[PDB]
Amino acid sequence: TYLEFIQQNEERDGVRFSWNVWPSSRLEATRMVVPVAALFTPLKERPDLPPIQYEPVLCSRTTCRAVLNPLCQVDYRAKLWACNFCYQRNQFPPSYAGISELNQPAELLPQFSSIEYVVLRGPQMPLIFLYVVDTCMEDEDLQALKESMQMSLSLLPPTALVGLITFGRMVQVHELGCEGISKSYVFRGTKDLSAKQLQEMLGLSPPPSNRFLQPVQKIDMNLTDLLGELQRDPWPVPQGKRPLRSSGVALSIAVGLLECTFPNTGARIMMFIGGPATQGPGMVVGDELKTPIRSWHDIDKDNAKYVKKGTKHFEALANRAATTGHVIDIYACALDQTGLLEMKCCPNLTGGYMVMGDSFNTSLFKQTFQRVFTKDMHGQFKMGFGGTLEIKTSREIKISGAIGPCVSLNSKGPCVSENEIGTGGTCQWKICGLSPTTTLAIYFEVVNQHNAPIPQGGRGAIQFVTQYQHSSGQRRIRVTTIARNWADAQTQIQNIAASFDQEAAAILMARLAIYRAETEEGPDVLRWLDRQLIRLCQKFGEYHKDDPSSFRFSETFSLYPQFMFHLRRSSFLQVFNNSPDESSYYRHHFMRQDLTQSLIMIQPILYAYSFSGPPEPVLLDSSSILADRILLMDTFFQILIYHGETIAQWRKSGYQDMPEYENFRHLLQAPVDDAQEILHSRFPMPRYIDTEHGGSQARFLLSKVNPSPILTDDVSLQVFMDHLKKLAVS
Ligand SMILES: [Zn+2]
């Protein structure tokens, strides 16, 4: 089964390919409109497998150096292995001399196609956490933020190094390790500062001691008291004015601080803001409340003064922190926009988190901020730091590029395609921050000539190697080797077509579309998206020419156009009903999510709970809203519960509470158990809504159903389908 294949290979290798059978011909690979691409989760949580306590064995050929993997043929008589990539014959290290067919090392076993090594790379390093805190907010929000930060301090490893940079109109860099007296350097939040500047201005260069960054359990009590001591920015806010907030200067100081003290090691720069930057480089809006912040209309009509300048400021800091190996988080809670559009590149490129909300004094934020510090079954943070991702391919496949939370390392080589996609031109990327959630999209190109024979073994291989700093300080190397069969398209079209993963392809094409819209500022992303959908219909559909009623799709393709119908009208591509900060927020989380959550984002799921049936997903239509059943809707960003008319009065009357009807008792608790399960797992925490037929709060449900570029923009899926069928049969 291909369903069973897709599911097993993601659970084991954390990979979802657009096509699980690849065409031998580079010419026919183009003719299949969706490229050979994969969603890749490098740290896919794998509790069944143990960590391997020795060094990976590497192919001795200089131009290759691939890791020993289960696809390598082994001469158990001669104690040699042949690399599946370059066919070099390699000897095993003398530790393996007792290798045999029935007693082979872990890396050769098919259960370890995905494997993690624990290696020794010199001195261990403690985790670093730099809190950059906005103090231009109300005392309630500031006090609530103080609790969450004190709480996070209690969870950090005892050896972890912490530091505090507070800022309002001024930027104050605090000094730790000093007890009985505390110093602080104060900067104007009006001028920018470089690394070499800050080093000389702060005078920088077996228990270790740095002035600005100190161990947690060693200076634990002084800081948690200080966070409670922290009060508002003392400057008064005049009439109709916004506080002078200089977040861009504080971030530049925070980035430059770690840059010339602890470069090239794990560090989180966590910026908390309760409003937009109003002063200094990186400013998003003036201090006059008379002038509104932003809108997609203002920037479109070129009426946004501070957008282009401020964006360049944060882009410069993002590439400095990514080059240094540092993570930048942004926790923004305010009643209005905070500048996420101009700041998105800092978490987007370093793998840092982006969190939205109305205030810090909400359940939503407090629960989200502690999910950041979720520990695994061994008591260690689920965070990884300074990940280097190297990909190696068979000589018939080249790498077009990657799309997701990463930065290119500019590693050229034979596997790198000349035609680039996303973050391309390299076979290595840096990912400063990652978790078992982090999912990149890698795009490949079949290079084998059209009339060339099928490659040697009949299957193409791809190896993913991820070296990262574990949250325990250990150096880990995660290796995943996959293989898919080559196919002669001239004789095996149905084999290729049957291996199509429509869910993976839809998301893989979505990342292309969103990257092309958000980056490079494409004007007609939909016209590309519509054209590719029509070709896929013309290629893999069944029809008689000029007969739209004849058109049909097999089960392997039938869901793809519906995905495209919701994608092209979703908030990731149509932004003019959200604020620029909101649009950047949705795209930030989509670009780093697995397949399951990505499908939920593009096409929200609607489960119906009715008698005489288990919970069944139903069409996102007003027709699904029936009186007999209770429906759950997941939007990823939000969860909603809705009860029909007849069920609404049953519950208020209390038949649930009757000892007669245990029948109704479990029907109104089943979706709440299911909703609460998604609540306490997803990151960030989604906002939750429970409503009924009266539905004062049920407006978002109806706004997601029946809500009101060659293909039609009509809201009715059928009208979109009948137009797609018409064009596919031309
Ligand atoms: Zn090799």
XYZ file of C-alpha atoms and ligand atoms in Angstrom:
731
model
C 0.000 0.000 0.000
C 1.211 3.506 -0.798
C -0.688 5.012 2.142
C 1.084 2.560 4.446
C 4.398 3.360 2.742
C 4.028 7.134 3.189
C 3.074 6.737 6.848
C 5.890 4.339 7.768
C 8.587 6.390 6.055
C 7.605 9.590 7.853
C 7.387 7.888 11.247
C 10.882 6.453 10.714
C 12.779 8.942 8.542
C 10.701 12.082 9.099
C 10.341 12.563 5.347
C 7.399 13.149 2.982
C 8.186 13.112 -0.739
C 6.077 14.605 -3.503
C 6.783 11.472 -5.582
C 7.850 8.180 -3.990
C 8.828 6.723 -7.383
C 11.166 8.886 -9.405
C 11.378 9.086 -13.207
C 14.696 8.060 -14.723
C 14.438 10.793 -17.374
C 15.126 14.431 -16.566
C 12.786 15.328 -19.427
C 9.796 13.471 -17.974
C 10.538 14.778 -14.469
C 9.710 18.238 -15.813
C 6.542 16.833 -17.398
C 5.369 15.767 -13.958
C 4.516 19.295 -12.931
C 5.388 18.910 -9.220
C 9.160 18.536 -8.667
C 10.741 15.749 -6.669
C 10.740 17.380 -3.236
C 10.549 16.344 0.394
C 9.364 17.732 3.678
C 12.198 16.867 6.073
C 12.031 16.847 9.897
C 15.702 16.361 10.889
C 15.035 15.884 14.619
C 11.831 13.851 14.213
C 11.217 12.560 17.728
C 12.106 8.858 17.699
C 11.577 7.344 21.166
C 11.965 3.755 19.885
C 15.635 4.287 18.887
C 18.609 4.748 21.234
C 21.569 7.106 20.755
C 24.715 5.541 19.321
C 27.821 6.217 21.425
C 30.516 6.205 18.735
C 31.748 8.134 15.699
C 30.155 7.714 12.251
C 32.138 5.716 9.700
C 32.738 7.843 6.606
C 33.472 6.802 3.031
C 37.206 7.156 2.412
C 36.810 8.726 -1.040
C 37.651 12.412 -0.667
C 34.983 13.748 -3.033
C 32.204 11.943 -1.097
C 32.715 11.007 2.574
C 29.184 9.637 2.927
C 28.146 7.969 6.182
C 27.856 4.191 6.391
C 24.158 3.401 6.006
C 21.911 0.365 5.405
C 21.985 0.831 1.611
C 25.698 -0.041 1.441
C 26.541 -3.508 0.175
C 28.932 -5.341 2.499
C 31.494 -8.059 1.776
C 31.219 -9.902 5.086
C 33.976 -12.258 3.932
C 36.553 -9.553 3.154
C 35.255 -7.155 5.866
C 34.672 -4.356 3.357
C 31.764 -2.098 2.480
C 30.938 -0.348 -0.786
C 29.521 3.166 -0.590
C 26.084 3.339 -2.189
C 26.850 6.843 -3.528
C 30.299 6.556 -5.146
C 30.942 2.769 -4.978
C 34.240 3.244 -3.158
C 35.316 0.092 -1.336
C 36.028 0.907 2.313
C 37.402 -1.037 5.252
C 35.705 -1.031 8.621
C 37.439 0.391 11.684
C 39.140 -2.374 13.691
C 36.371 -2.140 16.308
C 34.074 -3.874 13.789
C 36.238 -6.942 13.090
C 33.575 -9.297 14.462
C 31.013 -8.119 11.911
C 28.910 -10.820 10.257
C 25.625 -11.238 8.406
C 23.695 -11.957 11.621
C 25.757 -9.569 13.817
C 26.194 -6.329 11.864
C 26.663 -2.834 13.347
C 23.678 -0.645 14.128
C 24.223 1.728 11.199
C 23.827 -1.141 8.700
C 20.461 -2.310 10.060
C 17.357 -1.097 8.175
C 15.805 -0.052 11.500
C 18.577 2.574 11.696
C 18.002 4.219 8.332
C 17.524 7.170 10.685
C 20.168 7.109 13.413
C 21.709 9.543 15.890
C 25.355 9.494 16.948
C 26.779 11.027 20.123
C 30.323 12.251 19.502
C 33.131 14.094 21.285
C 34.054 17.460 19.773
C 36.208 19.056 22.451
C 34.968 21.211 25.311
C 31.327 21.180 26.335
C 29.469 24.490 26.341
C 26.591 25.709 28.518
C 23.400 27.128 27.071
C 23.070 30.915 26.856
C 19.837 32.874 27.350
C 19.672 36.656 26.908
C 16.415 38.298 28.007
C 15.739 41.569 26.162
C 12.712 43.111 27.844
C 10.487 46.027 26.861
C 9.478 48.241 29.783
C 7.121 50.633 27.944
C 3.882 48.875 28.834
C 1.209 48.836 31.514
C 2.178 47.579 34.962
C -0.207 44.615 34.707
C 1.422 43.400 31.491
C 4.893 44.125 32.877
C 4.218 42.249 36.122
C 2.766 39.286 34.216
C 5.869 39.265 32.012
C 8.044 39.372 35.140
C 6.485 36.155 36.458
C 6.967 34.236 33.204
C 10.624 35.270 32.975
C 11.321 34.387 36.613
C 9.622 31.049 35.927
C 11.781 30.334 32.867
C 14.892 31.029 34.954
C 13.917 28.134 37.237
C 13.832 25.661 34.327
C 17.203 26.471 32.753
C 20.158 24.121 33.325
C 22.173 25.121 36.405
C 25.256 25.784 34.252
C 23.322 27.827 31.674
C 24.595 31.378 31.189
C 22.008 34.154 31.440
C 22.003 37.898 30.895
C 19.571 40.789 31.092
C 19.184 43.722 28.704
C 16.335 46.062 29.633
C 15.187 48.869 27.374
C 12.682 51.656 27.148
C 13.587 55.047 25.755
C 17.116 54.002 26.792
C 18.854 50.623 26.491
C 20.331 49.407 29.790
C 22.774 46.482 29.736
C 22.868 44.872 33.173
C 25.901 43.255 34.801
C 25.715 39.953 36.675
C 27.934 37.956 38.995
C 28.225 41.060 41.183
C 26.393 40.754 44.505
C 25.894 43.525 47.032
C 26.337 45.978 44.143
C 25.170 45.985 40.529
C 26.441 48.000 37.565
C 24.657 48.866 34.331
C 25.763 50.453 31.055
C 23.171 52.773 29.497
C 22.916 53.657 25.799
C 20.855 56.111 23.799
C 18.124 54.202 21.993
C 18.690 56.623 19.116
C 21.970 55.467 17.532
C 22.983 52.082 16.180
C 26.046 50.185 17.385
C 28.317 47.671 15.667
C 30.180 44.713 17.163
C 33.675 46.231 17.176
C 32.163 49.398 18.647
C 30.385 47.574 21.472
C 33.475 45.504 22.313
C 35.663 48.579 22.815
C 32.850 50.441 24.584
C 32.456 47.500 26.997
C 36.175 46.652 27.092
C 36.184 43.021 25.971
C 38.798 40.952 24.142
C 39.202 26.778 36.512
C 35.879 28.582 37.081
C 34.998 30.915 34.188
C 33.651 34.417 34.746
C 32.238 36.831 32.180
C 30.811 40.147 33.343
C 27.555 40.358 31.378
C 26.679 36.632 31.178
C 26.586 34.528 34.341
C 25.559 31.043 35.421
C 22.025 30.554 36.520
C 22.162 28.705 39.822
C 25.124 30.779 40.825
C 23.297 34.111 40.405
C 19.806 32.609 40.525
C 18.228 34.585 43.364
C 19.646 38.001 42.428
C 18.020 37.910 38.987
C 14.589 36.562 39.948
C 14.410 39.318 42.558
C 15.577 41.853 39.960
C 12.855 40.754 37.534
C 10.293 41.401 40.255
C 12.024 44.715 40.959
C 11.692 45.764 37.311
C 9.249 48.651 36.896
C 8.006 50.648 33.918
C 10.108 53.040 31.897
C 10.086 56.152 34.127
C 9.541 58.523 31.200
C 6.002 59.965 31.100
C 3.898 59.546 27.968
C 2.293 62.869 26.909
C -1.187 63.274 25.430
C -2.053 61.264 22.324
C 1.479 59.866 22.165
C 3.128 56.485 22.065
C 6.044 55.702 24.400
C 9.509 56.084 22.900
C 10.419 52.433 22.310
C 13.817 51.641 20.779
C 13.627 47.897 20.161
C 15.881 47.959 17.098
C 18.730 49.495 19.088
C 18.243 47.045 21.964
C 18.328 44.064 19.589
C 21.458 45.399 17.885
C 23.167 45.703 21.272
C 21.919 42.245 22.266
C 23.180 40.681 19.026
C 26.528 42.471 19.162
C 26.958 41.517 22.818
C 27.008 37.761 22.208
C 28.779 38.230 18.869
C 32.090 39.253 20.482
C 31.742 37.184 23.675
C 30.367 33.728 22.756
C 30.285 33.332 18.966
C 29.483 29.986 17.345
C 27.545 28.257 20.129
C 23.961 27.837 21.260
C 22.262 31.003 22.490
C 18.702 32.341 22.641
C 18.112 36.081 22.316
C 14.530 36.370 23.583
C 13.068 39.808 22.864
C 9.826 40.666 24.665
C 7.990 43.717 23.325
C 4.707 45.364 24.268
C 4.524 47.778 21.365
C 6.225 49.007 18.203
C 9.682 50.502 17.905
C 9.142 54.271 17.837
C 12.701 55.510 18.078
C 16.025 54.666 16.501
C 16.977 52.473 13.591
C 14.375 49.782 13.200
C 11.557 52.144 13.991
C 8.155 51.055 12.683
C 5.942 54.078 13.509
C 6.202 57.603 14.864
C 5.301 58.629 18.395
C 2.073 60.387 17.339
C -1.066 58.323 17.907
C -2.630 60.545 15.229
C -0.653 58.539 12.648
C -1.743 54.876 12.426
C 0.885 52.148 12.375
C 0.482 50.282 9.093
C -1.810 48.428 6.723
C -1.282 46.267 3.664
C -2.988 49.094 1.775
C -0.576 51.750 3.061
C 2.532 49.764 2.123
C 1.022 48.758 -1.231
C 0.243 52.378 -2.134
C 3.779 53.305 -0.976
C 2.414 55.264 2.012
C 4.602 53.419 4.554
C 7.585 55.581 5.477
C 9.341 53.329 7.998
C 8.892 49.883 6.429
C 11.788 49.640 3.965
C 14.368 51.238 6.271
C 13.296 49.277 9.343
C 13.174 45.946 7.518
C 16.753 46.358 6.278
C 17.802 47.023 9.886
C 16.428 43.735 11.219
C 17.552 41.788 8.144
C 21.107 42.922 8.893
C 20.823 41.658 12.475
C 19.225 38.385 11.358
C 22.128 37.510 9.066
C 24.629 38.514 11.760
C 23.032 36.226 14.352
C 22.564 33.338 11.913
C 26.197 33.612 10.782
C 27.195 33.566 14.465
C 24.929 30.615 15.279
C 22.560 32.504 17.589
C 18.773 32.248 17.898
C 16.450 35.264 18.073
C 12.984 34.829 19.581
C 10.333 37.562 19.511
C 7.463 37.586 22.032
C 5.130 40.439 21.040
C 2.006 41.168 23.095
C 0.134 44.423 22.473
C -3.314 45.615 21.466
C -1.989 46.835 18.095
C 0.762 45.807 15.689
C 4.298 45.553 17.072
C 6.442 45.518 13.921
C 6.600 41.775 13.213
C 6.625 42.481 9.466
C 9.907 44.393 9.795
C 11.280 41.910 12.357
C 10.173 38.556 10.898
C 13.589 37.777 9.391
C 15.265 37.382 12.799
C 13.243 34.315 13.926
C 12.584 33.215 10.318
C 16.292 32.819 9.495
C 17.683 31.630 12.850
C 14.866 29.222 13.693
C 13.663 31.423 16.529
C 10.109 31.526 17.800
C 7.513 34.195 17.002
C 4.636 34.606 19.473
C 1.626 36.935 19.173
C -1.096 37.995 21.569
C -3.073 40.873 23.004
C -1.259 41.077 26.350
C 1.278 39.223 28.442
C -1.378 39.012 31.188
C -3.277 36.263 29.362
C -3.437 32.506 29.717
C -2.522 32.273 26.025
C 0.943 33.773 26.506
C 1.885 32.123 29.810
C 1.075 28.650 28.486
C 2.913 29.379 25.230
C 6.060 30.723 26.896
C 6.502 27.593 29.016
C 6.019 25.278 26.032
C 9.260 26.866 24.799
C 10.971 25.046 27.689
C 9.285 21.659 27.237
C 11.564 18.835 28.391
C 11.798 15.351 26.900
C 11.357 12.028 28.775
C 14.941 12.478 30.139
C 14.473 15.966 31.592
C 16.293 17.992 28.923
C 14.948 20.801 26.752
C 13.676 19.769 23.320
C 15.807 22.536 21.777
C 18.729 22.031 19.436
C 21.376 24.641 18.676
C 23.730 25.371 15.797
C 22.531 22.711 13.385
C 24.550 22.069 10.235
C 22.442 20.214 7.647
C 24.345 18.538 4.811
C 22.534 16.657 2.043
C 24.149 14.169 -0.340
C 22.436 12.741 -3.412
C 23.062 10.143 -6.082
C 24.811 11.576 -9.139
C 21.486 11.533 -11.052
C 19.840 13.915 -8.541
C 20.962 17.454 -7.751
C 19.721 19.812 -5.030
C 17.716 22.847 -6.115
C 17.496 24.416 -2.660
C 15.568 24.536 0.591
C 12.668 26.561 1.996
C 12.267 26.962 5.746
C 13.958 28.230 8.908
C 17.552 28.028 7.716
C 20.478 29.963 6.295
C 22.756 28.901 3.458
C 26.356 27.953 4.198
C 27.360 28.261 0.509
C 28.738 24.723 0.208
C 29.147 24.077 -3.506
C 29.703 20.618 -4.932
C 28.499 17.996 -7.401
C 25.081 17.645 -5.735
C 24.225 21.354 -6.104
C 21.995 22.255 -9.041
C 22.689 25.326 -11.143
C 18.938 26.080 -11.061
C 18.221 27.395 -7.575
C 15.018 27.329 -5.519
C 14.536 29.175 -2.237
C 17.735 29.026 -0.198
C 19.705 27.342 -2.957
C 23.209 27.207 -4.362
C 24.440 25.020 -1.508
C 24.432 21.502 -0.115
C 24.782 22.778 3.469
C 22.523 24.968 5.589
C 22.766 26.333 9.113
C 19.781 26.085 11.468
C 20.609 27.928 14.684
C 17.416 26.825 16.419
C 15.414 23.655 15.891
C 13.095 21.238 17.674
C 11.432 17.905 16.766
C 8.884 20.132 14.969
C 11.281 21.965 12.638
C 10.531 20.898 9.069
C 12.445 22.016 5.984
C 11.333 21.540 2.383
C 14.158 20.327 0.113
C 13.668 20.539 -3.660
C 15.547 18.149 -5.940
C 16.139 17.939 -9.684
C 16.411 14.739 -11.705
C 19.515 15.155 -13.861
C 19.878 11.766 -15.629
C 19.533 12.187 -19.390
C 16.288 11.216 -21.100
C 17.753 8.286 -23.063
C 20.212 7.262 -20.347
C 19.744 3.831 -18.746
C 18.191 3.441 -15.323
C 20.910 4.067 -12.667
C 22.989 1.188 -11.319
C 20.978 -0.186 -8.428
C 17.581 0.833 -9.768
C 17.061 3.299 -6.919
C 18.162 6.829 -6.051
C 19.552 7.635 -2.614
C 19.586 10.787 -0.490
C 21.505 11.164 2.782
C 20.710 13.885 5.340
C 23.320 14.667 8.021
C 22.478 17.076 10.859
C 25.165 17.965 13.400
C 23.859 20.044 16.290
C 24.467 20.957 19.921
C 22.046 19.036 22.131
C 20.381 20.914 24.988
C 22.560 18.787 27.296
C 25.730 20.214 25.751
C 26.420 16.980 23.870
C 27.421 17.043 20.210
C 24.966 14.961 18.171
C 25.032 13.824 14.538
C 21.694 12.731 13.068
C 21.865 10.668 9.863
C 18.935 9.676 7.639
C 19.423 7.742 4.398
C 16.429 7.134 2.129
C 15.963 5.439 -1.231
C 13.247 5.526 -3.881
C 13.001 3.460 -7.048
C 13.861 4.846 -10.456
C 11.202 4.254 -13.096
C 11.222 4.106 -16.889
C 8.499 6.634 -17.695
C 8.255 5.334 -21.270
C 6.907 2.056 -19.827
C 5.897 2.719 -16.186
C 3.813 5.907 -16.020
C 1.241 4.278 -13.738
C 3.951 3.294 -11.240
C 5.091 6.917 -11.031
C 1.532 8.274 -10.871
C 0.578 5.821 -8.119
C 3.415 7.100 -5.904
C 2.113 10.681 -5.813
C 1.731 12.057 -2.279
C -0.951 14.682 -2.847
C -0.805 16.003 0.726
C 2.975 16.446 0.597
C 2.900 17.935 -2.902
C 0.212 20.461 -1.938
C 2.275 21.722 0.999
C 5.496 21.546 -1.033
C 3.911 23.676 -3.752
C 2.502 25.957 -1.056
C 5.963 26.746 0.319
C 7.053 27.596 -3.227
C 4.100 29.970 -3.578
C 4.473 31.646 -0.177
C 8.249 31.994 -0.531
C 7.726 33.533 -3.978
C 5.142 35.982 -2.579
C 6.787 36.952 0.715
C 10.296 36.881 -0.789
C 11.127 38.411 -4.199
C 7.693 40.096 -4.025
C 6.020 38.266 -6.880
C 2.951 40.000 -8.288
C 1.268 36.916 -9.831
C 1.865 33.942 -7.549
C -1.681 32.690 -8.154
C -1.280 32.625 -11.940
C 1.704 30.320 -11.459
C -0.251 28.268 -8.919
C -3.277 28.030 -11.222
C -1.167 27.046 -14.239
C 0.618 24.218 -12.415
C -2.717 22.830 -11.197
C -4.157 22.763 -14.719
C -1.129 20.929 -16.136
C -1.270 18.321 -13.366
C -4.909 17.792 -14.318
C -4.039 17.592 -18.018
C -1.233 15.098 -17.298
C -2.720 12.774 -14.654
C -6.456 13.257 -15.144
C -8.747 11.199 -17.352
C -11.004 12.904 -19.882
C -12.043 13.242 -23.497
C -10.819 16.456 -25.089
C -13.312 19.341 -24.927
C -15.604 17.433 -22.524
C -15.488 18.817 -18.961
C -18.062 16.366 -17.576
C -15.732 13.561 -18.675
C -12.954 14.685 -16.365
C -12.121 12.580 -13.346
C -9.197 12.047 -10.937
C -8.066 8.899 -9.208
C -8.056 8.646 -5.438
C -4.334 9.440 -5.493
C -5.008 12.919 -6.944
C -8.613 13.714 -6.001
C -7.825 15.934 -2.992
C -5.157 18.094 -4.663
C -7.415 20.701 -6.375
C -9.407 21.149 -3.163
C -6.140 21.919 -1.372
C -5.334 24.427 -4.118
C -8.823 25.917 -3.783
C -8.240 26.735 -0.118
C -4.572 27.695 -0.477
C -4.997 30.390 -3.131
C -7.712 32.077 -1.046
C -5.997 31.542 2.329
C -4.322 34.232 4.425
C -0.865 33.062 3.306
C -1.563 34.423 -0.198
C -4.477 36.888 0.208
C -3.302 39.272 2.932
C -5.567 42.317 2.551
C -7.938 41.157 5.328
C -5.195 40.791 7.964
C -2.635 43.219 9.310
C 0.946 42.952 7.994
C 2.043 41.648 11.399
C -0.625 38.929 11.318
C 0.285 37.841 7.783
C 3.958 37.552 8.737
C 2.888 35.514 11.773
C 0.869 32.961 9.793
C 3.643 32.556 7.219
C 6.296 32.230 9.935
C 4.631 29.164 11.439
C 3.652 27.595 8.104
C 7.251 27.714 6.831
C 8.470 25.451 9.669
C 5.622 22.972 10.309
C 5.256 19.273 9.520
C 2.790 17.938 6.948
C -0.094 17.303 9.349
C -0.207 20.823 10.790
C 0.480 22.403 7.386
C -2.629 20.762 5.918
C -4.643 22.076 8.872
C -3.398 25.607 8.155
C -4.298 25.643 4.459
C -7.506 23.588 4.698
C -9.121 23.718 8.159
C -10.710 20.434 9.212
C -14.327 20.166 10.395
C -15.251 17.026 12.364
C -18.912 16.103 12.881
C -19.981 14.318 16.078
C -23.358 12.653 15.502
C -25.306 9.655 16.705
C -24.977 6.402 14.732
C -21.454 7.355 13.659
C -17.919 8.039 14.843
C -16.527 11.570 14.406
C -16.377 12.130 10.661
C -14.781 15.085 8.847
C -17.308 16.936 6.704
C -16.991 19.460 3.880
C -16.117 23.004 4.943
C -19.606 24.179 3.969
C -22.661 25.698 5.615
C -24.495 22.492 4.695
C -22.343 20.632 7.226
C -23.878 22.807 9.962
C -26.734 20.420 10.762
C -29.050 20.315 13.760
C -28.317 16.726 14.840
C -24.518 16.870 15.149
C -21.840 18.790 17.050
C -18.881 19.915 14.949
C -15.254 20.648 15.832
C -13.154 22.931 13.659
C -9.385 23.110 13.765
C -7.628 26.014 12.170
C -4.304 25.438 13.876
C -4.293 29.025 14.966
C -7.674 28.521 16.564
C -10.024 25.756 17.727
C -13.809 26.083 17.773
C -16.706 23.978 19.069
C -20.256 24.341 17.739
C -23.449 22.485 18.669
C -26.557 22.152 16.524
C -29.915 23.626 17.463
C -31.490 20.444 18.838
C -28.390 19.484 20.842
C -28.097 22.988 22.311
C -31.324 22.707 24.313
C -30.688 19.092 25.355
C -27.488 20.204 27.094
C -29.028 23.199 28.881
C -31.957 21.094 30.110
C -29.475 18.676 31.674
C -30.183 15.285 30.095
C -26.402 14.906 30.249
C -26.793 14.982 34.044
C -29.528 12.344 34.021
C -28.553 8.854 35.228
C -30.760 7.662 32.351
C -28.691 8.938 29.424
C -25.049 8.064 29.653
C -25.663 8.189 25.887
C -25.778 11.994 25.672
C -23.216 12.434 28.466
C -20.330 11.180 26.311
C -21.406 13.010 23.141
C -20.920 16.508 24.588
C -17.618 15.545 26.255
C -16.000 13.780 23.283
C -15.127 16.942 21.269
C -14.040 18.809 24.412
C -11.610 15.988 25.204
C -10.416 16.139 21.593
C -10.131 19.939 21.592
C -8.321 20.048 24.944
C -5.874 17.424 23.664
C -4.930 19.668 20.739
C -4.762 22.625 23.149
C -2.082 21.209 25.467
C 0.173 19.962 22.643
C 0.306 22.486 19.828
C 2.748 25.314 19.771
C 2.022 28.046 19.958
C -1.132 27.553 21.932
C -4.187 28.240 19.849
C -7.115 30.356 20.951
C -10.159 28.301 21.920
C -13.870 28.942 21.323
C -16.948 27.004 22.478
C -20.330 28.130 21.143
C -23.735 26.842 20.035
C -26.695 27.575 17.758
C -27.287 31.021 19.253
C -23.713 31.705 18.250
C -22.721 35.205 19.273
C -19.182 33.774 19.259
C -19.856 31.385 16.335
C -19.133 34.090 13.746
C -15.604 32.833 13.061
C -17.000 29.408 12.142
C -19.312 30.907 9.523
C -16.522 33.273 8.445
C -14.393 30.216 7.632
C -17.209 28.581 5.675
C -18.950 30.408 2.838
C -16.639 33.302 3.456
C -16.693 35.988 0.819
C -4.957 34.425 -11.564
C -6.716 32.472 -14.255
C -9.033 30.270 -12.216
C -12.225 31.659 -10.694
C -12.180 33.474 -7.374
C -15.643 32.293 -6.540
C -16.210 31.050 -3.027
C -18.012 27.932 -4.172
C -15.709 24.935 -4.575
C -17.939 23.434 -7.269
C -17.773 26.557 -9.445
C -13.992 26.450 -9.067
C -13.990 22.756 -10.010
C -16.233 23.182 -13.058
C -13.913 25.919 -14.331
C -10.837 23.777 -13.672
C -12.393 20.842 -15.538
C -13.241 23.112 -18.477
C -9.650 24.315 -18.858
C -8.083 20.896 -18.261
C -9.879 19.345 -21.254
C -9.056 22.055 -23.836
Zn 31.475 7.243 -1.036
